[PDB]
Design a protein around this ligand. Structure first.
Ligand code: SAH
Ligand code: ZN
Ligand code: ZN
Length: 857
């Protein structure tokens, strides 16, 4: 028996002598002040565990000099990794923890260097292959009263780190149990090869023998272990000692890098307009030597009042009428988003900060030819033109503290005129985009969320843009009528009929692949293709639009805001690639892309790498012979697309689709696509569409979605009244659009029976483009219903009005139940029986006003 005569004493020791012993003589790190700011949401400075300190005392003693690629095996919250981010000779850190239920889930931190730390949870480091790394950490080992077990556990990790270890590598490896003649054997052998020594840390509790194989030490294995067994056996009878306290680690703030650079930015274009911003400022303009950008070009920063949020209020007025769903987690776990400068930069590091390799000479040709053709088609029966300051000032009606109060006020129009003749002449000055997150009610918390960005532009630079490319959305170029494929100017509810009318086409299945971050995947080839709108212009109309395309679309300057360790700045950056009117372009190129892909299925061309002469002829013929036939095969709204090709050879035609940028989401690249054989199953614009027979026998096609997605979004906002008029906007929307849901209607008739009548609905219910927002009136909702489905709905022939909500039909139960209903559950039944009661408690809380009652008897 080794000094493991101590484990015999330890685990066989009094429950309280245990918690005394554990702390006596050691070195603690008062955490009861960092653990307290992390719950507040404070994301700076703080270490996430008592482990930044641990790895601090080793690093500060030169026992480990992490550098370069650092891989952390067992990151947990992020103690060693986040700490290593702050360090200087480190470049990237890769964190890995099993995590999950029982284990320790990682924490996201704004701490200095954080952009250099990527943490992934859900990883059995034992089952993942080794990568190149300049330093290798590992803090795995669960202790146990059975030392034969943890010799096995330690043996298991020692075998792992040896796979990852290289002769030149820096390391730090928790040896959970080092006094067992199993590990001392393996350590003695691991030490001959890789060298280093076993070092006990003065920060570890006395209830373990943890020693660390640190690369840059040296020392006898056996004797260093018994040295610790003695020192730990002593403290069994050494009169309880306090616990020397260290200050925690101040892990800092802010983002480093400046090393890489990788975007030759035409300065002879973005130049005359970057000196503006550093003129406008300069009492602030610095150059952050620690900018995070790699595939965007950096230019300097300036001080900025922070802008964003990460809030989430429960619409407790919709929530008090939603009593059966307080348990369902895909409501009670759907936060708002995160627009704070940190969550914007956290999204930047992941979605916008990428590049896209150049397409192959042959893809390049196919994309030209097809656009060459499409543009020519799309305006077979259309002509481009300018849009009038009048039209713009006219468009002011919902779409200088104002924009209404900025166009009717002479000043702006001379400001837009100076830069106007500048574009004409070949420059911008005032043509920056100013990024910001889009608040959205995407779910994903724990108690979190984040996704998108919206390139907001100078209220006067839009005019130069609107004036050039406004004819697109204004003469309805991408309306189904003229584009055959587009669905512009079409009601979301009427988007169901358009898919039904496409199943009518003869072909394979219906396909609705989603592109992974479309705007980021726009290439210059897609930019210079969409530029061809100009070939079909002339005069002072080309020039202008040419400037738009060449000056602000292919060559744009952007500002974004990130937290420095000294306030929120606003960096200024430029990319040539990517895209910010970006709907018709996003529809134009999605068509072209889905044309090239349809073509691939059918074999009209065989290789992306080179299109042969006899092959770019077939392309033309195909395009001229069946081009309009295949446009009719698609339902395309921006980046969102539904397709029904000839055959299911489609679902494998990908050399083009992946070379153009347009890489599908949530699916390995060279894996065939998912077909839909039922068009009431295809998703398009975050909805699907059932076909619902009424009583008189008329065909309804009606939008639907996972009924949970609908309650959750409704129970969030960005007074009792300002929030009661937010439910009524959702409730009015559920009628009219989701009327076919036993749950939603029953819950909507309750919202409008607890929100006073005459109270007008307010703030957006959806940022959908195809949303008519027709649920905002204060009219009888059965009047509007007839107005949408019967009076104005074209696919509706018998204009015989309906005049009762009882004559309005639900889906069949099991569709309702499939698409997510709760009918059939004992709560849902209790919730309807006793509903005039939760109406009451919401009326008896929204004051004492005028109340109708819609609730059917
Ligand atoms: N097989 C495995 N693969 C990956 N992670 C594991 C693992 N087994 C345990 N872990 C995780 O590794 C962590 C080690 S304890 C975490 C401490 C952390 N390294 C720090 O510096 O603060 C545990 O949280 C556990 O969740
Ligand atoms: Zn300009
Ligand atoms: Zn449905």
């Amino acid at each position: 028996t080794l000094g493991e005569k101590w484990k015999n004493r330890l685990n066989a020791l009094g429950k309280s002598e245990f918690q005394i012993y554990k702390k006596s003589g050691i070195q603690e790190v008062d955490r009861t002040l960092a653990k307290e700011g992390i719950k507040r949401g404070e994301t700076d400075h703080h270490a996430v565990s008592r482990g930044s300190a641990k790895l601090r005392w080793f690093v500060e003693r030169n026992l480990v000099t992490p550098e370069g690629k650092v891989v952390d095996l067992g990151c947990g919250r992020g103690g060693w990794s986040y700490y290593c981010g702050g360090l200087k000779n480190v470049k990237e850190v890769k964190g890995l923890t099993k995590g999950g239920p029982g284990h320790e889930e990682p924490i996201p931190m704004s701490t200095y260097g954080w952009n250099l730390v990527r943490l992934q949870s859900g990883v059995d480091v034992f089952f993942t292959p080794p990568e190149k790394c300049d330093t290798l950490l590992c803090d795995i080992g669960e202790s146990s009263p059975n030392p034969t077990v943890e010799a096995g556990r330690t043996l298991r990790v020692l075998n792992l780190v040896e796979n990852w270890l290289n002769n030149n590598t820096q390391f730090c490896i928790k040896v959970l149990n080092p006094y067992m003649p199993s590990v001392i054997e393996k350590m003695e052998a691991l030490q001959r090869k890789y060298g280093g020594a076993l070092v006990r840390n003065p920060l570890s509790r006395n209830s373990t023998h943890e020693m660390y194989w640190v690369s840059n030490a040296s020392g006898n294995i056996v004797s260093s272990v018994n040295m610790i067994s003695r020192m730990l056996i002593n403290r069994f009878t050494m009169r309880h000692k306090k616990a020397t306290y260290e200050p925690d680690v101040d892990l800092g703030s802010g983002t480093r890098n400046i090393g890489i650079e990788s975007e030759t930015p035409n300065l002879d274009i973005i130049g005359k307009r970057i000196e503006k911003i550093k003129q406008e400022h300069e009492t602030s303009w610095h150059y952050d030597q620690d900018h995070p950008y790699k595939t965007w070009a950096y230019h300097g920063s300036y001080e900025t009042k922070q802008t964003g949020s990460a809030s989430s209020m429960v619409n407790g007025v919709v929530r008090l009428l939603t009593k059966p769903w307080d348990i369902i987690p895909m409501v009670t776990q759907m936060a708002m988003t995160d627009t704070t400068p940190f969550g914007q930069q956290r999204v930047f590091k992941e979605k916008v900060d990428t590049r896209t390799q150049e397409p192959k000479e042959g893809t390049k040709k196919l994309m030209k030819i097809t656009a060459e053709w499409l543009w020519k088609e799309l305006g077979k029966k259309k002509t481009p033109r300018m849009c009038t300051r009048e039209e713009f000032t006219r468009k002011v009606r919902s779409n200088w503290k104002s924009a209404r109060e900025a166009v009717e006020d002479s000043g702006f129009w001379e400001l837009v005129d100076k830069e106007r003749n500048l574009h004409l002449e070949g420059k911008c000055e005032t043509c920056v985009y100013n990024m910001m997150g889009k608040r959205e009610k995407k779910l994903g918390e724990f108690g979190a969320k984040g996704s998108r960005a919206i390139w907001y532009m100078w209220l006067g630079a839009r005019f130069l843009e609107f004036e050039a490319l406004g004819f697109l959305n204004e003469d309805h170029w991408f309306s189904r009528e003229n584009s055959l494929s587009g669905v512009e100017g079409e009601g979301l509810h009427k988007l169901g009929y358009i898919l039904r009318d496409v199943s009518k086409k003869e072909g394979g299945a219906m396909y609705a692949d989603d592109t992974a971050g479309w705007d980021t995947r726009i290439t210059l080839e897609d930019l210079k293709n969409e530029e061809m709108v100009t070939n079909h212009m002339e005069g002072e109309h080309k020039k202008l639009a040419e400037a738009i395309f060449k000056l602000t679309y292919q060559n744009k300057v952007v500002r974004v805001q990130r937290p420095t360790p000294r306030g929120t700045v606003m960096d200024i950056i430029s990319r040539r690639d990517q895209r910010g009117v970006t709907y018709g372009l996003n529809t134009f190129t999605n068509m072209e892309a889905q044309l090239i892909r349809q073509m691939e299925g059918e074999g009209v061309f065989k290789s992306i790498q080179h299109l042969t002469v006899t092959e770019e002829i077939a392309v033309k013929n195909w395009l001229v012979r069946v081009g309009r036939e295949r446009l009719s095969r698609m339902a395309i709204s921006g980046d969102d697309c539904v397709v029904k090709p000839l055959d299911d050879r489609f679902a494998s035609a990908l050399t083009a689709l992946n070379d153009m940028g347009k890489v599908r989401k949530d699916i390995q690249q060279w894996e065939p696509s998912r077909g839909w054989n039922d068009w009431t199953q295809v998703p398009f614009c975050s909805h699907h569409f059932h076909e619902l027979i009424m009583k008189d026998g008329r065909v309804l096609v009606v939008p639907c979605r996972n009924q949970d997605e609908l309650i959750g979004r409704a129970r969030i906002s960005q007074s009792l009244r300002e929030t009661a008029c937010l439910g009524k906007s959702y409730a009015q929307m559920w009628s009219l659009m989701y009327f076919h849901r036993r749950d939603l209607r029953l819950a909507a008739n309750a919202i409008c029976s607890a929100v006073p009548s005459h109270w007008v609905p307010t703030s957006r219910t959806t940022w959908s483009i195809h949303a008519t927002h027709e649920w905002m009136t204060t009219e009888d909702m059965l009047t509007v219903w007839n107005r949408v489905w019967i009076q104005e709905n074209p696919w509706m022939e018998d204009k015989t009005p309906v005049e009762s909500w009882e004559e309005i039909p639900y889906l069949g139960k099991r569709e309702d139940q499939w698409c997510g209903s709760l009918i059939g559950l004992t709560s849902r039944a209790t919730w309807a029986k006793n509903i005039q009661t939760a109406i009451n408690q919401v009326r008896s809380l929204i004051g004492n006003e005028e109340y109708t009652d819609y609730m059917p008897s």
